[PDB]
Design a protein around this nucleic acid. Structure first.
Ligand SMILES: [K+]
Ligand SMILES: [Mg+2]
Ligand SMILES: [Mg+2]
Ligand SMILES: [Mg+2]
Ligand SMILES: [Mg+2]
Ligand SMILES: [Mg+2]
Ligand SMILES: [Mg+2]
Ligand SMILES: [Mg+2]
Ligand SMILES: [Mg+2]
Ligand SMILES: [Mg+2]
Ligand SMILES: [Mg+2]
Ligand SMILES: [Mg+2]
Ligand SMILES: [Mg+2]
Ligand SMILES: [Mg+2]
Ligand SMILES: [Mg+2]
Ligand SMILES: [Mg+2]
Ligand SMILES: [Mg+2]
Ligand SMILES: [Mg+2]
Ligand SMILES: [Mg+2]
Ligand SMILES: [Mg+2]
Ligand code: NA
Ligand code: NA
Ligand code: NA
Lengths: 221, 400
RNA sequence: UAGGAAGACCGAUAGCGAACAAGUAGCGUGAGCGAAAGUUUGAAAAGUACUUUGGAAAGAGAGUGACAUAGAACCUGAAAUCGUGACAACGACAAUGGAAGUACCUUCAUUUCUCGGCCAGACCCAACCUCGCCGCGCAAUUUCCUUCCG
RNA sequence: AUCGAACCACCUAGUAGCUGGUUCACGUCGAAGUUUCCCUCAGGAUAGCUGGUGCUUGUUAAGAAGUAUUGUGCGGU
RNA sequence: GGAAUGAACCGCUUAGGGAUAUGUGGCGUCAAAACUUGUGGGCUCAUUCUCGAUACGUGAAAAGGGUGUUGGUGGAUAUCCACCGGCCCCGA
RNA sequence: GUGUAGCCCUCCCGAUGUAGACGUGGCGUGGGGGUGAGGACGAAGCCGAUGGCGCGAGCCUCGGAUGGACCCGCCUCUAGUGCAGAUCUUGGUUGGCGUAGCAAAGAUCUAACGGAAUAUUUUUAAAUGCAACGUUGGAUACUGGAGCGGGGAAGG
RNA sequence: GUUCAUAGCGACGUCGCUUUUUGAUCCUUCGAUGUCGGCUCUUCCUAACCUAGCGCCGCAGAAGACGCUAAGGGUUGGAUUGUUCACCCACUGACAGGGAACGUGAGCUGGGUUUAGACCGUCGUGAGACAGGUUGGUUUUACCCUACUUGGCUGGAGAUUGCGAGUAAAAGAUUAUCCGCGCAAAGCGGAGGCAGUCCGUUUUUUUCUGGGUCUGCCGUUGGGUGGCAUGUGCUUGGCGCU
RNA sequence: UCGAAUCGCCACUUCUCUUAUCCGGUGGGCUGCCCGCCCGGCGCCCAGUACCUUCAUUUUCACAAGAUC
RNA sequence: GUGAGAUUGUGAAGGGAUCUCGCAGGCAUCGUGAGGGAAGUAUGGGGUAGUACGAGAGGAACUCCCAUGCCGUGCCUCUGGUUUCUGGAGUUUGUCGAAGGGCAAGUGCUCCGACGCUAUCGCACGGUGGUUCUCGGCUGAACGCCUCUAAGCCAGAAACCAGUCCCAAGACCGGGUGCCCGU
């Protein structure tokens, strides 16, 4: 981040332009908080770079009143003699996920501190993450395999509001703008998607008669 | 064991730490909520404290024992030369806070503005803003500015203007600084397109305080308090003194904690820095909006008192001098000493109370000397009590 | 008081308090109490003439001597503690410690150099330990199966 | 500069069942806080637990056993 | 070696080291093991010192109540009464 | 042939431990009787990223840009024979630390001279030699005759 | 309790909770953890006196009783006594109860308790005794570490190292190969010619100069305006000029 | 200056929503059966399934002795 | 590759080999706000009103208005306090020969006294929205009656959270801007 003149000069001599490390982007919509954090923490220790988006759509089992009371109990804890040294109570949904993951890592060794450094935890889908590639999900924590239908659940964004978070309106305004831009673009290039589909079709009857049979045998044509 | 008796704790825990202010200039931390219905307008102004006096007025307040009677109220005088606008900044809102988009400069800046960027201006090359001036109006220069203004329109939520005071016009002898004080003032009301139009019109021009505030309104006063240095607990917090018989001193707190917890807590009074803090002090009523003495000689003249006099007392304001500029008169006190620069802001609290909506009509403004017990209002009163003196006679005899 | 003879003894914080101007210096009104300290530089003073800076003390050169880092409380000259040059790095877990590797250093040791006590890989014999695949006995497979009726 | 009996030297290295200390390595074994007596109860002697040295013997059992079987007695929880 | 922690609990008892297999205790992350095992059944929703979850460990609970929900037993009539359990709630 | 660098080769069974007991061709120090060597081509002592050997107490080689005259292996005899602590003894060194302080009795200033203590710059004058000492003249001030006056005893 | 078990109470029995009393024990401390009360100052608890909100009465109004959620805020001045406690006089919305080493002595004070002097009563033959009364009786040290209060100097992203590359940034010959309007559209607009050197595997190749005519500019000259708060900057209209 | 560890990439993926839900959407007939209608990809040794075409002695593993940045 | 150093134990000249460091930022301004702190609270009067209720006696309350107690943040125009401006004047003992002018009495003593500091002994000021508890309702089953409760919904305490207010990037701001240097 922020390449100094030493870095830009070295890249100029060597001829390098851009580089992108291998990163997995996880869409955290409709995911159980505790189960997703446990799966991600183990993957961090195994040497993976992970970016998670839409942290305000994480779900917690129980009613909103129950979970709000649980946070207010955590907020009550502070060092009486000097509260500026005491536990820090972060309020944004993305900060809450990072704190949950941190408690599932060995955080007082250099190995655990390095692992925590490899997680980003955005809210919504920012502009620098939209065009990177396809997002992934964790089927073991998808909340439609996890919760019974009749049980009440909490959305993390709604609970983070009412205890101090003050950017709910900003996040929903930006998310709606992203949907319209992505929806407009996806409707575009429907011609090239159809053209490619109409190219794979009619490619048969142009290929040799033996390769089509092999394709049919394996269920690809 | 509990306390034998109960009394409230000393001091306010919401003003911690009691440390020195990071800057000497008064700065508005927050601005009033924006209302798109009203027309665009400016929200703050920069003034200099220039002494105190008192006035007399009639109070209109039904149901009160002081209704339709005269009262005496002390006031504060603050010099307000016009400010100059030099820049435009736009802000966008992000899930992490507000971020600046860019800045548009005025292409013509005064020497006193560019002095703010140097520590030794006279012994320097004085190259600030030189390349921008050579480039701003060229074909690439106009395209670059149009690009920045487009980003303001598309993705901004707040518009502010960079303005600086004119210390050349404020010809004060005791104010030693010659570099302008620079600050940001928010534009409230209207849409983003209308806000930008007002900002562009107010570029390179002067802004007078009469265009920002009205005569009988209220305002907020962001300022920095007078300094006291390292002071003890009795003056810093207001704790009681110990009995005369105490060994090793009286002006102390006897017990600074219990055995457990085994440490001193942040709520116990300790000696340290007192004064030189930033405060806000809302709801100060404006009593008069004056004009420069060169254009309107009769500043302190009232409809009930036809004497021709200016706002400056006999012998001048102690430590400050003459008021040669426009000014504001505020009811009550203001934080800080004389010569300090102060920011006035449009109010945040609701202004629907009867005290805050009253109309003020002055009757008498005191201009006696503040050195000693002043007992003359003008210089002619003194020369009428005493007749010709010895020095006057000698001057006339020499004239012969 | 004069001589002699010795020692499986002590070896300068030891042996008499005293290897030395020691019952001395010093302490107490007094009766009394009572040390520290090897001059062991060198075979020989040959104990640094002379030049230069400095008020002097001294420093920088020169010279004597096998040795001056043997220069005058001067053989040898330890540890604790400190200065300087080079290097190693290191957040905050007080440091130290144990185990197992690795990165740089080695005025260390041993072996080899046209066969090698070096580093790897595969193969054979014996021994031990596993996996696949195929089966057996028993009335275990009749408190059961299947048809036609009431 | 000393007093519910001054100071100095000597008997005097006074006695202490009580407090503190007690300096190299490896190897073979390895406890007790219980019995009786004592002006005995913060200590001893005495038996028990342990080590060392053995003696007399034996090669399936000599005077073996914190265990069963069979027979035959005892008991008042 | 286990019960997070503990003289005395559980397992096991000790020359210097490898391979294999176990005991007590475990297999969401911290933390080795079901990369959240079963192609096994039920029960439970717990709002302010916050449902419950490793014995010894009184290292915290009683009498008395509740169709909250899920099971039994004994009687009338083709739903009603009486009584007794499980988990959860009040008493706290 | 108990015990050593075990006379050699197979095989079996045990191995922790406070107080305590016992064993060891077990380690180390000063001196005596014997025996065998070493040293000015360098003894003892001292130093160490000098390695090797031993489970260990320890032993031995190496280097010194250290030292300058004595000393050791083995068998035996002998003892003032092995230290981390005793509010241990005697010396030396040490953080705290350039720290706490050096505050009763009122107080000095100026010019000239003296002194090595200056008017010290080679890379206009001030911003690059500070601070402090004695005598004489002048100024200012204190003791205030129960005196920081002038003479004696005791003691020195 | 006018009749009426339960508005409010509630005997005879029985089940609990607390550690703010006093007992029981003897685990830690006898080469020492300064032993009562008051003064000063901060904090915590609720078993709620006042202030907020509700329900109920043997609640007509007023004044009250009881119960629930609630610890955010508040809870006084004096006479006698060393007192804690208690009792009186007044004010008030109210004058609730507790914990913090029975909070707090290198923070104070020293009235009490508890040495040595002395008097009385009772006890003792006596020296003496008494948790009986009375009077007089040294309160030592912070300059160290941490905590707290202010006050400054200065590194750091592999949290000091790697060259170990992740933007809440844009949107394209893989961000190169130009600008403006537009929805990551449909489409619509603007762009000065010549010659040389050095470079050149291509598509009007990549540069460096000289005129080459210049829109937009910087720095000027005065002179006419004109604006601003008025000694200092500008805008209009011509000179040549970079 | 630098010798370094990492070894898929794409202007077809890089939009959204549900899971008691026509899992590609979507009507009809008689409370579950039956009957209709329309519309990830490349990459692994000839730029492509076909004739043709240089691989050495680096002569038995060793970081791919090669690439990307 | 390049530019600086070092190789310091037993003369003095030369060359070599190697090891360390540097090869890129600097100064100045306007802002952001994660996190932490956090504050206002109570009484009386006017009017309602001699009204509602009550046989009488007696006797309410909300909107609205005006003051005050405690607490908090500041200020010095007025009033009070303070004087080593020893400012101006007065006065006692001593002293310079007297007058003038002074001096000593660790500020001789008395009166008045500016600037500054300071007192609820003087003055000014002390805000806005949400989520809910106890509780009260609407629709509505279980249970072809009912029921504020099971699903759902509404109103809502001096409580809780945020805004305003104080500190603020070890919260490592890829927030903006001005000039210098390298490319
Ligand atoms: K808080
Ligand atoms: Mg005292
Ligand atoms: Mg004045
Ligand atoms: Mg001696
Ligand atoms: Mg002696
Ligand atoms: Mg002992
Ligand atoms: Mg044993
Ligand atoms: Mg695991
Ligand atoms: Mg043993
Ligand atoms: Mg001896
Ligand atoms: Mg020793
Ligand atoms: Mg000092
Ligand atoms: Mg005198
Ligand atoms: Mg005298
Ligand atoms: Mg003590
Ligand atoms: Mg203590
Ligand atoms: Mg204390
Ligand atoms: Mg008697
Ligand atoms: Mg906070
Ligand atoms: Mg906050
Ligand atoms: Na003795
Ligand atoms: Na006896
Ligand atoms: Na004992």
């Amino acid at each position: 981040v922020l390449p100094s003149r030493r870095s830009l000069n070295r890249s100029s001599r060597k001829g390098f332009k851009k580089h992108r490390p291998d990163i997995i982007v996880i869409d955290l919509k409709d995911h159980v908080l505790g189960r997703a954090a446990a799966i991600v923490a183990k993957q961090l220790l195994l040497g993976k770079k992970i970016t998670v988006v839409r942290c305000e759509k994480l779900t917690i089992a129980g009613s909103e009143i129950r979970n709000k009371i649980k946070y207010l109990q955590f907020l009550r804890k502070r060092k009486l003699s000097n509260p500026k040294l005491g536990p820090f109570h972060h309020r944004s949904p993305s900060d809450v996920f990072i704190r949950t993951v941190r408690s599932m890592l060995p955080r007082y060794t250099k190995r655990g501190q390095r692992a925590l450094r490899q997680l980003v935890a955005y809210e919504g889908v920012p502009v620098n993450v939209v065009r990177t590639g396809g997002r992934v999900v964790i089927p073991k924590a998808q909340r439609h395999n996890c919760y019974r239908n009749e049980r009440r659940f909490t959305v993390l964004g709604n609970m983070c509001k009412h205890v101090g978070w003050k950017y709910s309106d900003v996040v929903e305004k930006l998310e709606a703008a992203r949907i319209e831009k992505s929806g407009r673009h996806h409707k575009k290039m429907e011609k090239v998607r159809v053209a490619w589909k109409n190219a794979r079709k009619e490619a048969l009857k142009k290929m040799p008669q033996k390769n089509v049979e092999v394709l049919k045998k394996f269920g690809l044509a | 064991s509990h306390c034998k008796f109960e009394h409230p704790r000393h001091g306010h825990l919401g003003f911690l730490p009691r440390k020195r202010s990071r800057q000497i200039r008064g700065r508005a931390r927050s601005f009033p909520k924006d209302d798109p219905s009203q027309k665009p307008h400016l929200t703050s102004f920069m003034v200099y404290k220039a002494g105190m006096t008192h006035i007399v007025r009639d109070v209109d307040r039904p149901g009160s024992k002081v209704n339709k009677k005269e009262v005496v109220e002390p006031v504060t005088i603050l010099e307000a030369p016009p400010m100059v606008v030099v820049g435009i900044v736009g802000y966008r809102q992000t899930p992490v806070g507000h971020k600046t988009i860019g800045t548009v400069w005025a292409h013509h800046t005064s020497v006193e503005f560019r002095r703010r960027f140097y520590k030794n201006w006279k012994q320097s090359a004085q190259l600030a803003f030189t390349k921008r001036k050579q480039f701003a109006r060229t074909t690439e220069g106009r395209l670059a500015e149009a690009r920045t203004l487009k980003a303001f329109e598309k993705k901004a939520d707040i518009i502010r203007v960079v303005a600086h005071t004119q210390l050349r016009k404020l010809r004060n002898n005791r104010v030693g600084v010659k570099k302008a004080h620079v600050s940001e003032i928010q534009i409230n009301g209207g849409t983003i397109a209308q806000k930008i139009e007002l900002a562009k019109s107010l570029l390179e021009k002067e802004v007078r305080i009469d265009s920002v505030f009205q005569q009988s309104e209220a305002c907020d006063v962001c300022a920095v308090t007078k300094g006291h240095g390292f002071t003890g607990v009795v003056k810093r917090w207001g704790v009681a003194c110990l009995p005369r018989k105490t060994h090793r001193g009286l002006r102390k707190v006897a017990c600074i904690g219990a055995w457990h917890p085994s440490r001193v807590m942040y709520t116990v009074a300790r000696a340290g820095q007192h004064g030189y803090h930033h405060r806000t002090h809302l709801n100060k009523k404006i009593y008069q909006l004056g004009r420069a003495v060169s254009m309107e000689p009769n500043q302190a003249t009232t409809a009930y008192d036809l004497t021709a006099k200016t706002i400056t007392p006999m012998g001048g304001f102690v430590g400050y001098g003459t008021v040669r500029n426009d000014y504001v008169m505020l009811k009550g006190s203001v934080a800080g000493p004389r010569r300090r620069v102060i920011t006035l802001r449009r109010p945040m609290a609701p202004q629907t109370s009867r005290k805050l909506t009253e109309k003020i009509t002055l009757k008498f403004i005191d201009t006696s000397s503040k050195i000693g017990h002043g007992r003359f209002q003008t210089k002619k009163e003194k020369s009428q009590w005493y007749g010709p003196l010895k020095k006057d006679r000698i001057r006339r005899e020499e004239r012969l």
